[PDB]
Design a protein around this ligand. Structure first.
Ligand SMILES: [Ca+2]
Ligand SMILES: [Ca+2]
Ligand SMILES: [Ca+2]
Ligand SMILES: [Cl-]
Ligand code: NA
Ligand code: NA
Ligand code: NA
Lengths: 4, 473
């Protein structure tokens, strides 16, 4: 869902 | 007489100062006496090495939490691949200790620095909300170098809890002055991604920050969009220098890169600015960024002058941050008037898109009402539409003062047939313009394919005030  | 830092890697921090003028003008703010004392910044990321020799002196447990494991200690999880180094690198950009013989210095090298360990695990809506809403009467500034996937086909933003955290932060945070949320605009340049398809950067409550290379060019990873507000230096090609910061395992790195490095530098500059005037509201801070950022020598083919004489680019917003100008302008800043919101439902019937659709509407911007706006801040075109191949769409919005904002450029990889469901495309490019008059929305098929769809809702949402304008630039 979320990435660096 | 101000003495600059003696840290061993400070001479390699080309973006902080120099004779050359390709810098963020941070030494000028230091010489005015602003180094971040009393300001609290939190890095929302994969953890912070709180015992790092260049962070320990500034570390603040009150600015820290571990949402992934539900404990107070944001220490990164150590692995052979050093996967969880990202947050420590970001923290050193903000607040690495100065004059201690270790690595380089943070922009706000006397600020207090914390970290929220929240990326090392499944990043749910609840995880984001608990991180964005952490200790909002203690933390002043939140820095986020993360977001939805940069594959150039995702449209995604804060879900309900995270959006509630944004509104709670800007409304009640920092004693009612509003939490400052700084966002990295994205690494999707190679995928032709648009940072307006990212609801975090596209939010009016975040300062979305893009990147420039050392030689003043648009980096390969950069995403262009109208919601970006300003720019800080970051990495580029292999002849251009990179960002110097604290690394995992108590090391120093000179190779921090990407959009991830730009937001922390902006957060540090905002920390210096808050020290110069602690009474600044979340909207004050965006006004300061708009007025003081510098286009000069940033190369782009889309520089345009808006209705109030300011140069604006979809790659850079209003240009490079200028710390010295920020802290100078902050000191005697007059608080802006309360924010007004004027909602204009544009359509009287759905409209087939076809090859090209243009929707023109003349608005009064709530003339005669308490939410009358003559001085725009953010504007949104909230669009609901169906289309068979989303990434073939290009969407533009023209303000009454003639400023053409690209709300959406073609995204070759976005094959989705799901269209846009009240997606609030945002532009910063008409800031301080009078929004009364004719607005124009353009939707076009950029491909030769026989695409098809319908625009069923277009709400123009204007934010701003009715007082306090400057003579145009
Ligand atoms: Ca922990
Ligand atoms: Ca140091
Ligand atoms: Ca993106
Ligand atoms: Cl609102
Ligand atoms: Na408030
Ligand atoms: Na934003
Ligand atoms: Na007008």
């Amino acid at each position: 869902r979320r990435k660096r | 007489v101000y003495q600059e830092p003696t840290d061993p890697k400070f001479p390699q921090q080309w973006y902080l100062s120099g004779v050359t003028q390709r810098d963020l003008n941070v030494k000028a703010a230091w010489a005015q006496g602003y180094t971040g004392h009393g300001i609290v910044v939190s890095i929302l990321d994969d953890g912070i090495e709180k015992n790092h020799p260049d962070l320990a002196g500034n570390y603040d447990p009150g600015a820290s939490f571990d949402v992934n494991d539900q404990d107070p200690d944001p220490q990164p999880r150590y692995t052979q691949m050093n996967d969880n180094r990202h947050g420590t690198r970001c923290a050193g950009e903000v607040a690495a200790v100065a004059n201690n013989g270790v690595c380089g210095v943070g922009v706000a090298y006397n600020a207090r620095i914390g970290g929220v360990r929240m990326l090392d695990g499944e990043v749910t809506d609840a995880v984001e909300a608990r991180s964005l809403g952490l200790n909002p009467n203690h933390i002043h500034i939140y820095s986020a170098s993360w977001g939805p996937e940069d594959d150039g086909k995702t449209v995604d933003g804060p879900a309900r809890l995270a959006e509630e955290a944004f509104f709670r932060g800007v409304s009640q945070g920092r004693g009612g002055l509003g939490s400052i949320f700084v966002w990295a605009s994205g690494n999707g340049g190679r995928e032709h991604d648009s940072c307006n398809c990212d609801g975090y950067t596209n939010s009016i409550y975040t300062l979305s920050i893009s990147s420039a290379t050392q030689f003043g060019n648009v980096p390969w990873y950069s995403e262009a969009c109208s919601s970006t507000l300003a720019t800080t230096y970051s990495s580029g090609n292999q002849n251009e220098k990179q960002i110097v910061t604290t690394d995992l395992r108590q090391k120093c790195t000179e190779s921090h890169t990407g959009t991830s490095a730009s937001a922390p530098l902006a957060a540090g500059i905002i920390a210096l600015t808050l020290e110069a005037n602690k009474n600044l509201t979340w909207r004050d801070m965006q006004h300061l960024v708009v007025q003081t950022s510098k286009p000069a020598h940033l190369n782009a083919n889309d520089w345009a002058t808006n209705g109030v004489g300011r140069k604006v680019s979809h790659s850079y917003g209003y240009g490079l941050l200028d710390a010295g100008a920020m802290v100078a302008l902050a000191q005697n800043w007059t608080t802006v008037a309360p924010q007004r919101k004027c909602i204009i439902d544009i359509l009287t019937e759905p409209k087939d898109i076809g090859k090209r659709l243009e929707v023109r509407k003349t608005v009064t911007a709530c003339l005669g009402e308490p939410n009358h706006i003559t001085r725009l801040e953010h504007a949104q075109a909230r669009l609901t539409l169906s289309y068979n191949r989303r990434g073939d769409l290009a969407i533009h919005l023209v303000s009454p003062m003639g400023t053409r904002s690209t709300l959406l450029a073609a995204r070759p990889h976005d094959y989705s047939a799901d269209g846009f469901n009240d997606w609030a495309f945002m532009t910063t490019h008409s800031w301080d313009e009078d929004p009364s008059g004719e607005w124009v929305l353009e939707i076009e098929n950029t491909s030769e394919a026989n695409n098809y769809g319908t625009l069923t809702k277009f709400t123009l949402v204007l934010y701003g005030t009715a007082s306090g304008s400057l003579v145009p630039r």
